[PDB]
Design an enzyme around this catalytic site. Structure first.
Site, mmCIF file in Angstrom:
data_model
loop_
_atom_site.group_PDB
_atom_site.id
_atom_site.type_symbol
_atom_site.label_atom_id
_atom_site.label_comp_id
_atom_site.label_asym_id
_atom_site.label_seq_id
_atom_site.Cartn_x
_atom_site.Cartn_y
_atom_site.Cartn_z
ATOM 1 N N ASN A 1 -15.492 18.995 -31.691
ATOM 2 C CA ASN A 1 -16.804 19.470 -31.259
ATOM 3 C C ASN A 1 -17.639 20.106 -32.374
ATOM 4 O O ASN A 1 -18.363 21.073 -32.129
ATOM 5 C CB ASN A 1 -16.643 20.473 -30.117
ATOM 6 C CG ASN A 1 -15.874 19.897 -28.943
ATOM 7 O OD1 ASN A 1 -15.540 18.707 -28.924
ATOM 8 N ND2 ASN A 1 -15.594 20.739 -27.949
ATOM 9 N N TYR B 1 -6.806 29.726 -27.431
ATOM 10 C CA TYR B 1 -6.528 29.334 -26.059
ATOM 11 C C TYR B 1 -5.540 30.318 -25.445
ATOM 12 O O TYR B 1 -5.576 30.577 -24.239
ATOM 13 C CB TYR B 1 -5.968 27.911 -26.020
ATOM 14 C CG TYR B 1 -7.029 26.856 -26.218
ATOM 15 C CD1 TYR B 1 -7.993 26.620 -25.239
ATOM 16 C CD2 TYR B 1 -7.074 26.094 -27.382
ATOM 17 C CE1 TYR B 1 -8.975 25.650 -25.412
ATOM 18 C CE2 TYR B 1 -8.052 25.120 -27.566
ATOM 19 C CZ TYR B 1 -8.998 24.902 -26.578
ATOM 20 O OH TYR B 1 -9.956 23.933 -26.755
ATOM 21 N N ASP C 1 10.711 44.854 -48.163
ATOM 22 C CA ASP C 1 10.071 46.085 -47.714
ATOM 23 C C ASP C 1 8.576 46.096 -47.968
ATOM 24 O O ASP C 1 7.789 46.010 -47.033
ATOM 25 C CB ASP C 1 10.719 47.294 -48.390
ATOM 26 C CG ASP C 1 11.768 47.952 -47.517
ATOM 27 O OD1 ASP C 1 12.573 48.751 -48.051
ATOM 28 O OD2 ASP C 1 11.778 47.680 -46.292
ATOM 29 N N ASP C 2 8.185 46.207 -49.233
ATOM 30 C CA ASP C 2 6.772 46.230 -49.583
ATOM 31 C C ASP C 2 6.450 45.235 -50.696
ATOM 32 O O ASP C 2 5.591 45.482 -51.541
ATOM 33 C CB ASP C 2 6.356 47.649 -49.984
ATOM 34 C CG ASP C 2 7.095 48.164 -51.212
ATOM 35 O OD1 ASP C 2 8.086 47.531 -51.644
ATOM 36 O OD2 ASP C 2 6.680 49.218 -51.742
ATOM 37 N N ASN D 1 -20.138 18.099 -21.993
ATOM 38 C CA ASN D 1 -18.731 18.407 -22.245
ATOM 39 C C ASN D 1 -18.108 18.783 -20.907
ATOM 40 O O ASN D 1 -18.521 19.756 -20.271
ATOM 41 C CB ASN D 1 -18.627 19.582 -23.229
ATOM 42 C CG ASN D 1 -17.189 20.000 -23.505
ATOM 43 O OD1 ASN D 1 -16.946 20.956 -24.245
ATOM 44 N ND2 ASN D 1 -16.233 19.291 -22.915
ATOM 45 N N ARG E 1 -9.448 26.493 -34.184
ATOM 46 C CA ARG E 1 -10.799 26.211 -34.638
ATOM 47 C C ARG E 1 -11.741 27.364 -34.343
ATOM 48 O O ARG E 1 -12.875 27.391 -34.824
ATOM 49 C CB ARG E 1 -11.322 24.915 -33.999
ATOM 50 C CG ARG E 1 -11.612 24.972 -32.493
ATOM 51 C CD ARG E 1 -12.289 23.679 -32.029
ATOM 52 N NE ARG E 1 -12.891 23.773 -30.699
ATOM 53 C CZ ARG E 1 -12.236 23.656 -29.548
ATOM 54 N NH1 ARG E 1 -10.930 23.431 -29.532
ATOM 55 N NH2 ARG E 1 -12.895 23.773 -28.402
#
Length: 752
Positions: free
Chosen positions: A399, A230, A490-491, A121, A284
């Site tokens: 991968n 990333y 709110d909730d 890789n 991923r």
């Protein structure tokens, strides 16, 4: 001594923790021990023979980039164990040399210029290995002869001589070139590393493709939401490099570097909950056992601590307050348990300083238009919403990783409460991948990795306090369309589904929820005031259900209530599920160990080939059984409409009205009238004012959105882009959304 030497030493301290790394500190000492213990384990398993065909039998095969990269990581750990003041291996001669012999052997038999730069890789050959090798070179610099350093540095130069990629790959390139440039003392290359941060995917805001966006979103690989994957890597590398060069002749001078502070406040903060980095933004990487949400969140705080070391005022101070809070918030996994020893030293310095107060927890609703994500942060809980569209892919799987990430971004809801471990502790290899909470799918059926064919994905934000999102659903793998909306108050989070149709000949279902239970899987739960059995391996249908209550894995702060306007029939089951991380991350290095977790899964069956089916439920975080029933007796939300044309909900108490319009036709939902696709939310304060926010989720309307509000106003103020044409007897205005990129426009009307 020159400036390069100075820089080299500064990097060494970043790796070792420095000469003042206090051994009396419980955590520092706890770390300098596991380092040696791990090194001795590797050093013991090594093959010190001169005829060895491998350094470690477990990693043999000088061609499999994966194994070689791992070999260098181990040799890095060993180098650390031999240079970290406090290690029971500090300054060990045999260890240092046994490491340098290994490196030479790898040079001749594996990592050298005789290999292709692009062999699988490529990442390991150009970034992974060089990053480890550079660190070893800095740590053991003094014990490295010119002859040896040449073979190490020349090889790294062959693989990555320059910086020309984007985002994380680019930043990684910068740190490879830069650290080496320091080691070999190339001011030219070090200047190039510094300048690399100004490139695409890093300092400058992206408007398309990879990078950080102004709205807070982060994307990588063109179409994936990646702030926690990333993005984390970009942050860590950028923070480390900037800190390194800070104060030197090559200190970053690019004014856009200030954008980095915003990444913290806008891109990362809203997506952190008591130390966990929401999975919906980790691509991923959710399939990686060594990177579950809290472990990743720790790495993010480590970067914040790193920035706090050189950031200008008042950012340094704010970063310190942020880190301090997250460290105290996370009672699931000690932060000092998996960050660099130097991070521990600097962290402790912040935590032990009484003049530094923990930052306040985020409290808002944020729409990440650029990456089809949305989040609600409140006291006691947080809700993350993952969607996808013609712009953002369903999920990423490359991968051999995240092969079952199918519905993790298809109208998936993630609830965070006092159960800090919900999504960690092997959740991903055991949860039913076909039943991700909040989603509507063809039972036990997967979909493809890629973008959808619908542009209507996104939502509206009301002054960053309340909001509503929506996703026009139409899978490509099979036939199934629907209108899905979420309204965040709110909730209460109200979820609506309509126009659910299919010709796939497969039972269609919508997942109300799928929660990991305690080790015994006996969490109490109730329906309509009646307790339900707590045994494992029991499937059961609840018919005529008005409300359900599930007790959390903690005495307080983790209960979840579910209210069903109009009542519903619920399909459920409570089971122990077994699996392995290998099953979702098929890489040789992935542990194949079996794990078992308990789950309570609830869903609505729409039958096979439904036509115009719908659902409506309300999520009620942190409410007791008694409180859920209390709510049911007088619910604060009221479904205004749930057709394929418009989905609207009203919150009586707060005077809020949200409406998602799905067609380019004039339609009304309570006081709101719209002539085009739009996400709208208004807030009314009786005889005081009428607030209103509007967005074009499609990010494709090149004209306007004509709105009309059934109220009479006395005056107004509005964001530019909104043109008001009438205030009486009704409110009328148009929002210029051309190129708005899914942002919300806000107006405020004075009422008589």
């Amino acid at each position: 001594s020159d400036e390069f030497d100075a820089l080299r030493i500064k990097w060494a301290t970043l790796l070792t923790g420095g000469p003042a790394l206090d051994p009396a500190d419980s955590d520092i000492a706890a770390r300098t021990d596991k380092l040696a213990q791990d090194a001795n384990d590797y050093w013991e398993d090594m093959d010190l023979s001169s005829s060895r065909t491998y350094i470690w039998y477990a990693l043999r095969g000088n061609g499999t980039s994966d194994n070689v990269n791992a070999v260098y990581e181990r040799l890095r750990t060993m180098a650390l164990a031999a240079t970290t003041v406090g290690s029971s291996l500090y300054g060990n001669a045999d260890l240092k040399e046994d490491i340098l012999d290994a490196l030479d052997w790898l040079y001749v038999n594996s990592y050298n210029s005789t290999r292709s730069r692009s062999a699988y890789n490529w990442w390991h050959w150009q970034l992974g290995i060089p990053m480890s090798l550079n660190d070893i070179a800095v740590l053991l610099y003094d014990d490295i002869s010119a002859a040896r350093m040449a073979t190490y540095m020349d090889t790294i130069d062959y693989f990555t001589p320059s910086i020309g990629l984007t985002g994380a790959a680019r930043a990684w390139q910068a740190i490879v070139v830069g650290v080496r440039a320091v080691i070999v003392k190339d001011a030219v290359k070090l200047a190039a590393a510094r300048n690399g941060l100004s490139g695409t995917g890093i300092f400058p805001y992206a408007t398309g493709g990879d990078g950080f966006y102004a709205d807070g979103s982060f994307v990588q690989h063109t179409t994936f939401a990646y702030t926690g994957g990333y993005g984390s890597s970009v942050l860590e590398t950028t923070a480390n490099l900037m800190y390194l060069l800070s104060g030197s002749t090559w200190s970053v001078s690019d004014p856009n570097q200030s954008n980095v502070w915003q990444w913290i406040y806008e891109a990362y903060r809203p997506l952190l909950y008591k130390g966990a980095m929401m999975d919906m933004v980790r691509g991923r990487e959710i399939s990686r056992s060594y990177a579950q949400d809290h472990a990743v969140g720790h790495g993010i705080v480590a970067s914040i601590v790193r920035l706090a070391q050189f950031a200008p005022a008042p950012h340094a101070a704010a970063f310190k307050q942020i880190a301090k809070r997250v460290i105290q918030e996370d009672t699931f996994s000690s932060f000092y348990g998996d960050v660099s020893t130097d991070t521990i030293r600097l962290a402790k310095a912040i935590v032990d300083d009484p003049s530094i107060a923990p930052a306040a927890a985020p409290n808002l609703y944020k729409q990440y238009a650029a990456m089809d994500r949305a989040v609600l942060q409140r006291p006691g809980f947080a809700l993350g919403l993952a969607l996808y569209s013609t712009r953002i892919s369903s999920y990423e799987s490359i991968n051999s990783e995240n092969g079952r990430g199918w519905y993790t971004g298809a109208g998936a809801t993630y609830l965070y409460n006092q159960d800090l471990a919900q999504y960690s502790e092997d959740y991903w290899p055991t949860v039913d991948a076909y039943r991700i909470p909040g989603t509507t799918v063809a039972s036990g059926t997967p979909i493809a990795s890629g973008t959808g064919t619908s542009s209507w994905t996104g939502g509206v934000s009301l002054a960053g306090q309340y909001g509503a999102s929506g996703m026009d659903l139409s899978y490509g793998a099979y036939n199934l369309s629907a209108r899905k909306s979420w309204f965040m108050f709110d909730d209460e989070i109200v979820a609506l589904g309509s126009g659910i149709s299919s010709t796939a000949g497969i039972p269609i279902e919508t997942v109300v929820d799928n929660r990991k239970l305690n080790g015994a899987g006996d969490n109490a739960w109730t329906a309509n005031g009646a307790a339900l059995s707590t045994g494992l391996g029991v499937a059961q249908t609840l018919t005529g259900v008005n409300w359900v209550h599930l007790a959390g894995n903690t005495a307080d702060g983790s209960d979840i209530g579910y209210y069903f306007p109009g009542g519903a029939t619920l399909q459920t089951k409570r089971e122990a599920r077994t699996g392995t991380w290998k099953q979702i991350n098929n890489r040789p290095a992935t542990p194949s160990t079996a794990v078992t977790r308990n789950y309570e899964t609830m869903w609505i069956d729409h039958g096979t080939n439904p036509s115009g089916a719908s659902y409506g439920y309300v999520l009620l975080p942190n409410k007791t059984s008694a409180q859920v029933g209390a709510y049911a007796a007088d619910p604060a939300i009221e479904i205004v409409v749930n057709t394929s044309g418009v989905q609207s909900v009203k919150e009586k108490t707060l005077g809020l009205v949200g409406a998602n319009f799905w067609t380019d036709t004039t339609q009304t939902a309570d006081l709101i009238t719209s002539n085009k696709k739009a996400s709208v939310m208004t807030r009314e304060i009786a005889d005081e004012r009428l607030e209103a926010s509007v967005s074009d989720p499609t990010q494709a309307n090149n004209g306007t959105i004509a709105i009309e509000l059934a109220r009479s106003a006395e005056g107004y103020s509005a964001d530019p882009g909104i043109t008001v044409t009438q205030l009486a007897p009704t409110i009328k205005f148009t929002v210029n959304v051309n190129g708005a990129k899914g942002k919300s426009f806000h107006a405020s009307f004075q009422l008589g």
